[PDB]
Amino acid sequence: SDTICIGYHANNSTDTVDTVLEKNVTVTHSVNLLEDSHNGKLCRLKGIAPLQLGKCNIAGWILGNPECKRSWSYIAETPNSENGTCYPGDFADYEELREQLSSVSSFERFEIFPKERSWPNHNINIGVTAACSHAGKSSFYKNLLWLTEKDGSYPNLNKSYVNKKEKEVLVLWGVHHPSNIENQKTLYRKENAYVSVVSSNYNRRFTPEIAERPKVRGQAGRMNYYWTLLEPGDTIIFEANGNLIAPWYAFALSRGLGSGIITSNASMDECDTKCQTPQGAINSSLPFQNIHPFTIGECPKYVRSTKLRMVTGLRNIPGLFGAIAGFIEGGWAGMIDGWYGYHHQNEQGSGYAADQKSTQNAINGITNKVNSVIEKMNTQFTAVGKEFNKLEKRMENLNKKVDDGFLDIWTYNAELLVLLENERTLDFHDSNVKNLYEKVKNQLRNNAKEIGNGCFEFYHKCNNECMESVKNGTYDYPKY
Amino acid sequence: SDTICIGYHANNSTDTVDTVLEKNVTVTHSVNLLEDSHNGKLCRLKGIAPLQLGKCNIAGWILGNPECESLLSKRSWSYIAETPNSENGTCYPGDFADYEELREQLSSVSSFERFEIFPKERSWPNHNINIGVTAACSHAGKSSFYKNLLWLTEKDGSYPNLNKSYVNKKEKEVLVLWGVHHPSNIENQKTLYRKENAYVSVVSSNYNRRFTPEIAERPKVRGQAGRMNYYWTLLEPGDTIIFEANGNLIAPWYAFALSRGLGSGIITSNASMDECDTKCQTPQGAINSSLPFQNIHPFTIGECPKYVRSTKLRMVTGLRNIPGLFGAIAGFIEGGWAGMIDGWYGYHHQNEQGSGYAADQKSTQNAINGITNKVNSVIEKMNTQFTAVGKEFNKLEKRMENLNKKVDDGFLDIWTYNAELLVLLENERTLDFHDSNVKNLYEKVKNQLRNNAKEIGNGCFEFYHKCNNECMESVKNGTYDYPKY
Amino acid sequence: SDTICIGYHANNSTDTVDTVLEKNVTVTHSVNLLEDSHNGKLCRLKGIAPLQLGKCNIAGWILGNPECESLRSWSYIAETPNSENGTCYPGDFADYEELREQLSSVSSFERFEIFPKERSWPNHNINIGVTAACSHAGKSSFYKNLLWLTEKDGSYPNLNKSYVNKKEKEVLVLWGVHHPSNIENQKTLYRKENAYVSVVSSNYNRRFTPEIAERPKVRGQAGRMNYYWTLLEPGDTIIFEANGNLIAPWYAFALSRGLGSGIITSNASMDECDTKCQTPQGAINSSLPFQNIHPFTIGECPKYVRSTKLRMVTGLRNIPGLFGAIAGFIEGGWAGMIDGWYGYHHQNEQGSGYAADQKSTQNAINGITNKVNSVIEKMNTQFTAVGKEFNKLEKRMENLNKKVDDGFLDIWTYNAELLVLLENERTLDFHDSNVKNLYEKVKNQLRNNAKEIGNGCFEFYHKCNNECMESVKNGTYDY
Ligand SMILES: *[C@@H]1O[C@H](CO)[C@@H](O[C@@H]2O[C@H](CO)[C@@H](O[C@@H]3O[C@H](CO)[C@@H](O)[C@H](O)[C@@H]3O)[C@H](O)[C@H]2NC(C)=O)[C@H](O)[C@H]1NC(C)=O
Ligand SMILES: *[C@@H]1O[C@H](CO)[C@@H](O[C@@H]2O[C@H](CO)[C@@H](O[C@@H]3O[C@H](CO)[C@@H](O)[C@H](O)[C@@H]3O)[C@H](O)[C@H]2NC(C)=O)[C@H](O)[C@H]1NC(C)=O
Ligand SMILES: *[C@@H]1O[C@H](CO)[C@@H](O[C@@H]2O[C@H](CO)[C@@H](O)[C@H](O)[C@H]2NC(C)=O)[C@H](O)[C@H]1NC(C)=O
Ligand SMILES: *[C@@H]1O[C@H](CO)[C@@H](O[C@@H]2O[C@H](CO)[C@@H](O)[C@H](O)[C@H]2NC(C)=O)[C@H](O)[C@H]1NC(C)=O
Ligand SMILES: *[C@@H]1O[C@H](CO)[C@@H](O)[C@H](O)[C@H]1NC(C)=O
Ligand SMILES: *[C@@H]1O[C@H](CO)[C@@H](O)[C@H](O)[C@H]1NC(C)=O
Ligand SMILES: *[C@@H]1O[C@H](CO)[C@@H](O)[C@H](O)[C@H]1NC(C)=O
Ligand SMILES: *[C@@H]1O[C@H](CO)[C@@H](O)[C@H](O)[C@H]1NC(C)=O
Ligand SMILES: *[C@@H]1O[C@H](CO)[C@@H](O)[C@H](O)[C@H]1NC(C)=O
Ligand SMILES: *[C@@H]1O[C@H](CO)[C@@H](O)[C@H](O)[C@H]1NC(C)=O
Ligand SMILES: *[C@@H]1O[C@H](CO)[C@@H](O)[C@H](O)[C@H]1NC(C)=O
Ligand SMILES: *[C@@H]1O[C@H](CO)[C@@H](O)[C@H](O)[C@H]1NC(C)=O
Ligand SMILES: *[C@@H]1O[C@H](CO)[C@@H](O)[C@H](O)[C@H]1NC(C)=O
Ligand SMILES: *[C@@H]1O[C@H](CO)[C@@H](O)[C@H](O)[C@H]1NC(C)=O
Ligand SMILES: *[C@@H]1O[C@H](CO)[C@@H](O)[C@H](O)[C@H]1NC(C)=O
Ligand SMILES: [Cl-]
Ligand SMILES: [Cl-]
Ligand SMILES: [Cl-]
Ligand SMILES: [Cl-]
Ligand SMILES: [Cl-]
Ligand SMILES: [Cl-]
Ligand SMILES: [Cl-]
């Protein structure tokens, strides 16, 4: 019945964290705040799969490029999505259309102007081109119809469609611009033609501009593509005496709020996520991720960090208060049941025992600390990526300034928060051991000699009931 | 046996704060960092009332839709307020060029003066100035037209070419509006303007545009298959604007001399105007701006607290209320003293002359000063500027609308996280600071008493000698004369 | 009786810092985190000088305003506040802000004759297209990169000219369209009331119609010229067709663009200096995380803040708090201890002296160094041109850009101020802790062999010569 010692837990962990004052501190346990892995797959968002376009891009898909789902939560293109406008020309407000199609709750392709009945006095079946070939034969977009002259004339046409659905209708069409005056007259039998498209909101007149242009996909002519959204009850009216690439199929749809487009090598799998990146889906529980800036969903904040680890356990030794790695030089691998505690020796035996009160209080506090760093992060469904055309460089650079500024803010705060919390956590453990030592010293008083390494040497016999009284608050100083 | 004890203040407060290590800690006093209420009113900003539009929107008001009052007495405004029932706009259908840009540029004005740029009765001697009305723009059951525009038509079988200029001698910018009529058919074009091919030309030193009517049958909107597109420009002081046309001009009648204010915006609100002033207006009502954070609304106008999703941001200033790093408070000094009323930390003694409490004023006042500097830094370091958060985009600017949302949502996330974690960290430090001050007060006494007193272990010392009132005072004074005893 | 005391360093430093609990604490040493000065110079970014325009703006230089000099690569463009030579013939410059942005950084750049003046336009007058609105040296002149064709011998034949981009780079092609003030001038110049201009490539496709109208005079001209441009990709062809009103390309530019730079408006002057961050006032050092010189920087820059002082204490509070030692039971500091931060003063029969505790001081120096390095080195930055230019119909974009910059300004100012306050409080508590722990190490090492005096000193009950004193300072004292 000579001694009782205060000490702390150690184990065989080789985890390291950084603190304010020192790098690479080995600790008994740590927790990761940084999502640093992905599953390499395209997953469902809001329980709905993406639209995978594969070899096609949105232009090729929506026009019906011959080489190219009721709902989708985002759109996925590949880096080999090259099938788009097979006949060359300009696609009006293309980036805006991509954004507006990025999520739809309902989607239905339907024959807006039935090919065989809408155009009685035009040739409806020879508007094909080698620029739009499929299976070794010349073809054309499957959603448009290239009307041409019949029996030496191209009569004026006047065709309307009233959206009598309960949804928006996306209508697409084109205007052909021949390379020379001879092609104009062969196809449309007049030199000066017009195309007119009007709705309640849309109002435009197009005039073919004939010019010899550098050949693209073998074509010196051009076809410009146009679209509008018809609200329920609205009417669209087409009028032309030439050069019209008429709607054949259109799309009734309900647009979803705010998604986006991913360019990715990943393929779809049976997985659900809250956050999709171009590399793959990631978990959304942690506050930070270093996978990719251009995510879609309710996502961790993107950071440039490679490591964000919070210590939960102790400095591992198999601070401000001078106890841990101070006057108590090392930890106890033999104390397996807690963080701080006792070792004793008397005539009845020896052994380690954790102080459960201080241990459990400290566990509760460290768990509340980690939970706060994680759960205070507020998130919303956001599609980070944005697309800008060659005449929107200023907007593209403003968007980048926004993404990069957020990246800089979150990287700095996340790194410094982890360093600061890790410093506080080790001082907290140091304080708890220090306060445990003083509780014992103040009970024992002059009935024991302080050795100076955390241990006390009793001047009387301290049996097991006496030892238990010291771990309890109730040591009976005068009784000895 | 005579005794002296070290202790700390407790009261009947039920304030709670959160810390890093523990939630819902009851404390003796705390302060709020979050503006969480509004007054439900539209208030003046920079001392100037907003422009209230009511049943009209900006298009209806600025063109002079006959259902919109002219409101000619308002010379200035600091922001614009529309209601969700602001439905009177372009009564004759058509496109309003750069409408969102115009709304943004009209959102605050230092001075504003509607004046007759082209007097109806003398500017158009060879055109009809009296038949340009429409049932689409009716008022009081009769056909009418915009009060600031003039729909000229042919007179005596002809619509001669017109050539009209205006020199801006108002020493301010002049906002000029006009329209171009696009008839539904060729018969109406010839009826109104007596020629199939007409043009409108509008030129200044910086503006230069030519308009040609586009004749086509459109689906009827407000009964009209024709269309009217609306256009505007800001004419700089001293510059000249020249209109030339041989048909289809919806000519300016009234224009606006104005001095634009810098960077305000438009609010959509059910709230009504009151005789109140604010530094920060939200769509539900005005909020105070002394505190760094607010959770009322993201789309504020003025010098505003930062928007956060937090519901509670309370900093403890006082102590753990018990009616940790240093082990004194809720440690070896188990509870506080509701009887010590005069400070945060102090003493209780008992000798033959009596017993009682006494606060240590030096440590208390030093702690009050530090906590005050702490709270002031959290509040006063917030830099703010006059900003109108909200932005409006048309149906072909969805990418811009979403970029704007990404900015607003990103700031919301940054400020919510940083505010929550800052309060947690400050609260933990504040409680550690109090704990330290009590511990250091205890050690100052223990080191003077040395072995002339027995440590009990609950903050108290038991003297081995008689410690009269002068002896007690010397201990609190620091000037205890150990050799004497 | 012999004595050893524990104490801490003091000096003659007048540096002050702010802490959480108190302002204006005098400390023995501190480090600055805020760039508050510049060198008043325009320096090279990425090792490449800027393009200085001086009296000219980008329109005047790219079109070849005759008061503008013709020039090659650059990392950013510098305009002066006196840059007032642009389009000397009045008109509209299509997508001018876009062009300014896309020209702001180029890795190669060369002016070349795309359509030789002397032989490209055989049946037009090529040498009388000058105007008093573009005078130089007392004579009517014109842009040096464009050619104002006019009728010859009573007609302006149709023209039909193409250029194929064989340059293995993009080619910037500029042109204009003339809109005369009246029909007499239209006929005199172009012998034609109604003309057309057509310009087409693989990407570009536009047709221009001259509009005749009376307009208020600008630089004496009631006519206008509108200016246009496109980027011709390698291997592509541009084709011009017209029967009037064409201000034809004469010189164009083969160029390779660089990534996102911008334009600085500056009173500063070029010098032979390199920088990583350029402000309109001058170049700034980019080692520190924060700067208060200017919001609109170009390069890899410190974050812009409103702060006027961001000093971190590294040393001790200077006395010539959580742990109660510094300015506590050890009331003041020792200016006589010159070799470290914490240490000893002894006195015995052999004399007196101060000696730092080297183990304590070195661990503290390493910790404080790591603290300062983390605040500086964790700052992530990228090459960014902050400034943007918007025209008069882009005020919403201008205000959104301002909301971005002001938002970042408020975030970084608040965080930097509060970070420094918190770091400084912890640094001062760290030093306090280190002095207390050193004091306790000696106290428990001596136990009842010495008496505690109360000021950090112990009085020995026995003779403690120099070896004895050394054993205490070394930890090897044997009671
Ligand atoms: C759909 O996408 C595929 C893949 O991009 C397109 O196939 C590619 O078509 C181009 C143009 O026809 C081919 O390039 C050309 O090849 C010929 C060979 O005779 C050469 O003479 C031309 O100078 C040029 O290099 C390309 O090789 C071909 N790639 C593959 C893998 O087949 C296809 O044309 C697209 N189809 C539609 C309808 O959009
Ligand atoms: C290049 O930039 C210079 C600097 O602004 C231009 O010179 C300025 O030209 C204006 C217009 O010619 C001058 O203003 C005028 O003075 C005359 C009488 O001298 C008066 O009739 C006008 O009403 C106007 O007030 C101005 O004095 C002159 N400034 C200087 C410093 O010379 C120059 O025109 C530009 N040249 C080109 C080709 O861009
Ligand atoms: C914070 O703690 C206080 C004090 O315990 C809580 O208030 C008491 O909670 C008990 C048990 O739920 C109730 O019986 C009492 O009526 C509560 N007191 C009062 C004044 O309401 C309080 O609910 C806690 N708050 C949070 C958010 O945890
Ligand atoms: C001003 O706004 C009112 C309300 O929006 C318009 O009122 C309606 O007119 C339409 C068609 O003219 C009717 O279908 C509605 O029933 C009317 N609502 C009523 C009377 O409450 C009014 O036309 C607008 N006037 C102008 C000039 O814009
Ligand atoms: C370390 O301890 C863990 C837990 O007891 C055990 O899994 C492992 O085998 C031990 N030895 C190592 C990792 O070498
Ligand atoms: C197109 O046909 C409809 C059907 O009645 C007719 O009302 C309309 O006037 C026609 N459009 C034109 C321009 O004639
Ligand atoms: C896709 O894979 C190829 C080949 O490994 C690689 O070069 C390319 O960068 C990848 N792209 C994406 C978006 O992952
Ligand atoms: C341990 O201490 C508590 C009070 O802190 C007391 O109620 C309990 O009886 C003690 N246990 C023993 C075995 O004495
Ligand atoms: C607490 O005491 C103050 C003393 O003035 C009193 O005003 C208040 O009502 C009390 N509050 C409670 C909850 O008892
Ligand atoms: C703003 O503060 C004043 C005085 O502190 C107060 O009277 C008013 O109620 C506050 N306004 C709101 C909306 O809470
Ligand atoms: C106005 O009242 C309606 C009634 O439901 C409500 O939905 C709306 O949020 C209120 N505020 C605004 C700004 O419309
Ligand atoms: C108490 O402290 C003050 C502070 O300097 C001192 O002047 C005084 O002499 C001390 N003693 C008494 C009895 O006041
Ligand atoms: C302070 O001391 C340093 C080093 O001893 C010396 O260089 C400096 O001149 C001194 N300053 C003053 C004001 O005495
Ligand atoms: C800070 O303290 C020094 C030392 O007396 C003084 O000279 C200086 O004016 C003080 N500054 C402020 C802002 O109080
Ligand atoms: C321009 O020249 C090319 C080649 O000589 C020719 O093919 C083309 O038809 C010409 N354009 C016109 C409008 O004559
Ligand atoms: Cl552990
Ligand atoms: Cl903590
Ligand atoms: Cl209080
Ligand atoms: Cl801290
Ligand atoms: Cl603090
Ligand atoms: Cl120093
Ligand atoms: Cl620290």
Author numbering:
A (entry chain B): 2 to 69, 75 to 324, 330 to 491
B (entry chain C): 2 to 324, 330 to 491
C (entry chain A): 2 to 72, 76 to 324, 330 to 488
List passages from the publication reporting this PDB structure.
HA is a homotrimeric glycoprotein, with each monomer composed of two regions: (1) the head, comprising the receptor binding domain (RBD) which is crucial in viral attachment, and (2) the stalk, that is responsible for viral and cell membrane fusion in the endosome. Mammalian IVA infection is initiated through HAs binding to α2,6 sialic acid-linkage galactose receptors on the host cell surface, before entering the cell via endocytosis. Following endocytosis, HAs undergo conformational rearrangements due to the low pH of the endosome, leading to membrane fusion.
The full length mature HA1/HA2 trimer crystal structures are as follows: (1) A/Fort Monmouth/1/1947 solved at 2.95 Å resolution, (2) A/Jiangsu/ALS1/2011 solved at 2.35 Å resolution, (3) A/Almaty/32/1998 solved at 2.05 Å resolution, (4) A/Hickox/JY2/1940 solved at 1.95 Å resolution, (5) A/Netherlands/002P1/1951 solved at 2.5 Å resolution, and (6) A/Melbourne/1/1946 solved at 2.55 Å resolution. Comparing the structure of A/Denver/57 HA in complex with C05 Fab to our six other HA structures showed differences in the C05 antibody binding site. Arg146 was conserved with either a Lys or Arg in all strains except A/Hickox/JY2/1940, where an Ile residue was present. Glu203 were conserved with negatively charged Asp/Glu residues with the exception of A/Hickox/JY2/1940, that contained an Asn. Failure to bind correlated with an insertion in HA between 146R-G147 of the epitope, whereas sequences without an insertion bound the antibody. Our other IVA HA structures all contain an insertion near the C05 Fab CDR3 binding site that appears to prevent antibody binding, via either insertion of an Asn which becomes glycosylated to physically block C05 binding, or insertion of an Arg, Lys, or Ile into the C05 binding pocket. Although the insertion of either a glycosylated residue observed in the electron density of our structures (A/Netherlands/002P1/1951 and A/Fort Monmouth/1/1947) or of a bulky side chain which partially changes the loop conformation (A/Jiangsu/ALSI/2011, A/Almaty/32/1998, A/Hickox/JY2/1940, and A/Melbourne/1/1946) appears consistent with the loss of C05 antibody Fab binding by analytical SEC, rigorous mutational analysis and quantitative binding experiments would be required to prove these are evasion mechanisms.
